RNA sequence: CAAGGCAAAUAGGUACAGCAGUGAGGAAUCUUGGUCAAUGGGCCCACGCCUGAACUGGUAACUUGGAGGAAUGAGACGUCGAUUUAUCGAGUAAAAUUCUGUAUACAUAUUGAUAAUGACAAUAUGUACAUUUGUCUUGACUAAUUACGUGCCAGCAGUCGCGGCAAUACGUAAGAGACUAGUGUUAAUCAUCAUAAAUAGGUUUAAAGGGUACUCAGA
RNA sequence: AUAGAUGAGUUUGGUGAUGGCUCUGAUUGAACACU
């Protein structure tokens, strides 16, 4: 925060709403984004996060 | 509006009328705009499920009017409260 | 009918309505060009009574139909290539097709006022 | 282009009511039948004749495409708890008897007794009907334009739209020049001085201002678009009203739209110059637009 | 010659309708004429919209002295004076544009202001306290507790609202916890309790005055965690906002509403009718 | 070869990238392993700056993006210059200064 | 590798379902542009080269969004159409007056891009400009009227219908009701249609109970 | 996502049913006519 807010900002003052005082319907988005694989399994501790791994597969 | 659902029959002509929260408006054929617009109700969902008759459909419609779910009734014979839950919430009715 | 009977498939499409121009409705087509088989006339059916002017048209799909000539008064003979839209001559029998007014040689009606998009007539531009 | 939708704008003899201050308006205003005849009407020609007048005020300048979809059924609203009453009573009294209450003996008994009954517990203000029908056209007080027109900066929704569309208003300290935009609540909304003065002031006379040549206060000024010194137009006392989801400031012609008109029991806060029966029917046609 | 509907307009507009012409008196001139509750009604056939009253130039002073000068918590000056606490704050944020105003030496629209004050019916905060300015404690309906519910229950029950709201939803809350100035009902219990009204007021007092402390130490914890994720790198033209993200949260089926990235599989909707090409957010 | 490259999206005159995870060999905007942030190349201004400072708004996935450099992705010449900002790699280019 | 088409004959190429474009078919769908500046890709130690991918200019109301002007306007004691020739309308409409400077034009700056590279354009600011009406309907469904012409003729018609000499339904005139840079019509899809009913139908007399019930599978 | 469920014309001397047809709503990578 480098320039103050104005007095013409909705921000100026702060009152937040109680709770369940509006409905506003977000519309539906359309399209997708592609599902990051996994690095890891499920159960257990992989070996790729022990202390001497990346020096192992990736020595000097 | 009215108490609840409500279904008549009259010769093939079904009539079925449905209470609806505040603001729902009038949401019905237009002989039923008229009977609702007069007696006083705002909120209602109107359904005609056999025939389309325009004198059985008044007809029914006025006898469903007049076989409304009685609460207080259905309380006593029942032997248990039916609490309107909108009227203990803001406490009192909410015209 | 019983769940299993569902389940065996009981449930067909309904029968098809025959459409009101099939020429057009069958290939999803608004318009077809054709050529004038034959100009006439035909008379309608127990009602009404009169002359109805219509055109034995030969549509660019090989069929050939025949098309009512809307307004008073058409150019089109044998040998003219006229376009065809839906639309049928309800007193007359056959007769399940129109004529477009400002179509390629149909002329519009000339001494039309009044709902002149539908006969295919300019503006008499008068004013100007 | 004036379109044909506009020729008899402030017809005399259609008596159509504008959203405007003109003095045409004003005695079409005035001299509306108490009410429409629907006497004999169908449902059609009910909802038509409904349809006609409303849309003849409510969001006159946006077609009727753009508004079919505006429409809305979501018709917000309020109610009012007391402290007092919600501190000393948890809501069980509201379900005693078989759930609904106890029961209080008829109309003619009570008074037939010398003794009035108790005062029934309830929350102050209720048992009143709220005007739900009142706010069929509320979304249209949400544009930028209307709120302009709402808190007297502007004396049409037509001259407020141009002062829009001439980057003269500024939402939020940014200048905002489309007057489709809807108001959020909280925003700040900021027209030129000059140009509120202009819409609202009186016209520039250069007969009566041709005899002021020479012969807190103010003094003339005849530099300036508006009569000086500047007073307020005619007849605009007969609009003067603020609704309260408005907070206006006049010394700077700066409003905020602190929250979206609701109905509240007994109470609405969309100025519309129509009853709850005509109300009630342009509701009815936009549900099917039939 | 003019027609005579205009006859009979210029025969209204000078002999009843002279009276709008110009504004003499002091406070509203409607048609509709006063109602049944004091009010003006602006439009005779519609009795339900009212010329509700309107903040005296004295009184939006006196609530920026007692937010500004006296530091009083915002909920403190609207259970005060009745005024919404949604009002209280762009009061004060119009306030602030006038010592702008003031300050830079731009001259206010004065014969504007006065003129339309007196058009306008107006409430006096302070000594005169006819009646209050507006209800604060009007409660949003909430779509859940719209219906219509008759619930069975034994013939002894003591059916709160509590249960109420658990009747309509089990997310749904009571309307005691949907006040904007929710310590007014602590306040009355503690007449119930004959508290002296002196200690009473004390502890509202330090009631709002610690809620508001809370609001304004959460929005602070927040707006530092929105600067945490940004990384400001200066370059010899611009200034580089690198913000960090979870690129794994994107649901189950990458169809999440939150998700950040253009998504893939959608064409324009740009032919698409309703469709709104213009900023919905000025922040 | 994995990239961490951009593919462009928006409309005629108004480019908006997506900082992906693809092979290289592949279309632009085809769907890619993963989505590691956007860039935006118009700069911006803040609302209510009359400095007349610009910025860029650039979404990063730092903890993604080096997972990727560490096994071996190719980031192209304008996601290197991005990464090399933020402080994960060097640059490959400087302003000469004789 | 074979076949037919085009080209080729002592040859052995070509197939535009790559971009633009032409002919044909069709009711019907566009430029034989610029640049590799941006994003992506191939080759390269590097520099760099290539890219009808791509980015951008053009065509079409095909669609969507926006603009397309606001305020004042009373006796020009003028005009026009009906008609209870003095009533009812055109009509605050016009003219005129006072303002704005919207699309857009021009100018400056910034920006798309940086190590450097800008084909083309966006945004911001300043100055300047007040520019079209069109189309459908008008018996009922379905909002909206008369007069004349025509006389089961000419024609209208989505459904019911209208027209046979005093037609609010045809044609013209005026008015009125609507949408508007669009408006109608044709074609199609969903919904209307519990009108193939899983949710959720029905079969005495209206479409629909098998001629019969012992029985494998199945419920 | 808790507001979302609607009808109208037309068979009969007439009445009530059965049952289609058409209109009312939304839309198109549309075409045509008048603009
Ligand atoms: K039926
Ligand atoms: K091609
Ligand atoms: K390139
Ligand atoms: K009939
Ligand atoms: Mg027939
Ligand atoms: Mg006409
Ligand atoms: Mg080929
Ligand atoms: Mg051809
Ligand atoms: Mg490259
Ligand atoms: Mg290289
Ligand atoms: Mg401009
Ligand atoms: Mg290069
Ligand atoms: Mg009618
Ligand atoms: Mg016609
Ligand atoms: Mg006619
Ligand atoms: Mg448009
Ligand atoms: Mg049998
Ligand atoms: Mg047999
Ligand atoms: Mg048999
Ligand atoms: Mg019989």
Redesign the pocket.
């Known amino acids: 925060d480098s320039v103050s807010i104005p007095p013409d900002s909705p921000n100026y003052i702060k009152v937040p709403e109680p709770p369940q005082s509006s ?1 506003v ?4 988005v359309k399209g997708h984004l592609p599902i990051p694989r996994s690095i890891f399994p499920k159960k257990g501790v992989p070996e790729k996060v022990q202390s001497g791994y990346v020096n192992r597969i990736a020595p000097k | 509006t009215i108490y609840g659902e409500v279904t008549t029959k ?4 079904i009539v079925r009328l449905n209470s ?2 505040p603001g ?1 408006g009038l ?5 039923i705009f008229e009977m609702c617009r007069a007696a006083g109700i705002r909120d209602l ?13 008044v007809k029914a419609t006025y006898q469903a009017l007049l076989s409304q779910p009685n609460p207080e009734d259905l309380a006593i014979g029942r032997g248990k409260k039916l609490v309107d839950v909108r009227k203990v919430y803001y406490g009192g009715s909410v015209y | ?1 019983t ?2 009977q ?1 389940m065996r498939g ?6 098809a ?1 025959h ?3 099939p020429a ?2 069958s ?7 054709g050529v004038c088989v034959k100009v006439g006339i035909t008379r ?1 059916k127990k ?7 219509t055109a034995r048209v030969r ?2 799909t090989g069929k050939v139909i025949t098309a009512y000539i ?4 058409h150019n089109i003979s044998q040998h003219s290539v006229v ?1 065809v ?8 029998p056959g007769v399940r097709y ?1 004529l ?4 390629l040689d149909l002329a ?1 009606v000339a ?13 008499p531009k008068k004013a100007s | ?5 506009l ?8 008596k159509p009511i504008r959203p ?5 308006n004003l005695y079409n205003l005035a001299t509306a039948g108490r009410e429409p005849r629907i006497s004999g009407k ?1 449902f ?2 009910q909802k ?1 004749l409904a349809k ?1 007048l409303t ?1 003849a005020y409510h969001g006159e ?1 946006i ?4 508004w ?1 979809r505006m429409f809305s ?2 018709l917000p609203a309020v109610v009012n708890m007391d402290p007092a009453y919600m501190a000393k009573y948890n809501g069980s009294e509201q379900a005693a008897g078989r759930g609904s209450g106890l029961s209080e003996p008829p109309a003619y008994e009570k008074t037939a007794d010398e003794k009035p009954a108790k005062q029934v517990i309830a929350n102050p203000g209720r048992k009143v009907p709220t005007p739900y029908e009142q706010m069929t056209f509320a979304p249209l007080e949400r544009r930028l334009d209307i709120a302009i027109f709402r808190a007297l900066f502007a ?2 929704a ?2 407020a ?2 002062m829009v ?4 208003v500024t939402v939020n300290g940014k ?1 905002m020049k ?3 935009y809807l108001l959020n609540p909280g925003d700040l909304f900021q027209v030129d001085v000059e140009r509120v003065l ?1 819409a609202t002031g009186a ?2 006379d ?1 007969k009566l201002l041709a005899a002021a040549m020479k012969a807190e206060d103010n003094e003339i000024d005849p530099s300036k ?2 009569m000086t010194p500047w007073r307020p137009r005619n007849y605009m006392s007969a609009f003067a009203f603020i609704p309260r989801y408005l907070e206006v400031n006049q010394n700077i012609c700066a409003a905020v739209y602190l929250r979206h008109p609701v109905a509240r029991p007994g109470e609405s806060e969309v100025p519309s110059p129509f009853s709850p029966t005509i109300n009630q029917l342009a509701f009815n046609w936009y ?4 | ?6 006859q009979k307009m ?1 025969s209204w ?2 002999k009843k309708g002279s009276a709008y012409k110009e504004h003499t008196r002091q406070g509203p001139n409607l048609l509709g004429g006063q109602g049944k509750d004091g009010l003006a009604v602006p439009f005779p056939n519609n009795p339900y919209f009212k010329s509700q009253p309107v903040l005296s130039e004295g009184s939006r002073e006196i609530i920026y002295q007692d937010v500004m000068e006296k530091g009083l918590p915002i909920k403190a000056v609207s259970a005060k004076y009745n005024v919404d606490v949604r009002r209280v704050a762009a009061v004060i944020r119009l306030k602030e544009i006038e010592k702008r105003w003031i300050k830079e030496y731009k001259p206010l629209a004065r014969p504007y202001a006065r003129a339309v004050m007196k058009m306008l019916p107006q409430t006096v905060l302070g000594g005169p306290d006819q009646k209050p300015h507006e209800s604060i404690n009007d409660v949003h309906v909430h ?2 507790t ?2 219509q519910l008759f619930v069975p229950v034994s013939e002894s029950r003591e059916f709160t609202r509590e249960d109420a709201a658990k009747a ?2 089990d997310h749904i809350l009571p309307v005691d916890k949907k006040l904007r100035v929710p310590e007014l009902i602590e306040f009355q219990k503690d007449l119930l309790k004959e508290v002296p009204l002196q200690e009473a007021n004390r502890k509202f007092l330090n009631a709002t005055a610690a809620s508001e402390a809370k609001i304004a130490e959460r929005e602070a914890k927040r707006r530092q965690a929105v600067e945490d994720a940004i990384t400001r790198v200066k ?4 200034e580089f906002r690198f913000q960090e993200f979870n690129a794994e949260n994107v649901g189950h089926d990458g169809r999440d509403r939150n998700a950040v990235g253009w998504r893939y599989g959608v064409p324009f909707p ?6 709104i ?2 900023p919905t957010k000025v922040e | ?1 994995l ?1 961490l ?4 999206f928006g409309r ?4 908006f ?1 997506n900082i992906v995870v693809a092979h ?2 592949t ?2 905007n085809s769907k890619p392993l993963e989505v590691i942030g956007t860039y935006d ?3 911006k201004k803040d609302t209510y700056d009359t400095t007349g400072k ?1 910025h ?1 708004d650039i979404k990063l996935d730092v903890t993604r993006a080096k997972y990727w450099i560490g096994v071996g992705a190719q980031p ?4 290197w ?1 991005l990464l090399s900002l933020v402080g994960i790699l060097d ?1 490959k ?4 200064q004789p």
């Open positions: 409905e319907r977000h519309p539906f | 009259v010769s093939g002509t609806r929260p729902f949401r019905v054929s237009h002989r969902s109107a359904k005609f499920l056999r025939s389309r008759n325009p004198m059985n459909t | 009918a769940l299993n569902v009981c449930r067909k499409p309904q029968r309505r459409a009101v121009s057009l409705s290939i999803k087509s608004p318009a077809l060009k309608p009602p009404n009574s009169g002359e109805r002017k549509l660019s809307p307004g008073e008064g376009l839209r839906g639309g049928r001559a309800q007193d007359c129109h477009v007014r400002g179509a519009g001494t039309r006022m009044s709902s002149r998009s539908k006969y295919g007539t300019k503006k | 282009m004036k379109i044909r939708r020729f008899k704008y402030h017809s005399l003899k259609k405007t201050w003109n003095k045409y169908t059609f020609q038509w006609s849309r300048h077609k009727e495409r753009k079919a059924r979501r004396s049409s037509r001259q739209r141009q569309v001439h980057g003269a200048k489309h007057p489709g202009y016209p520039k250069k678009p508006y549900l099917r637009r039939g | 010659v003019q027609s005579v509907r205009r210029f507009l000078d779509s859940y719209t219906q309509f939803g370059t010899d033209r611009f740009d032919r698409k009718r309703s469709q090409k213009i | 070869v990239k490259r951009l593919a462009r005629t005159n108004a480019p990238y290289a060999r279309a632009r190349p118009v700069p610009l860029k192209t010449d304008t996601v210059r640059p280019y400087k302003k000469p």
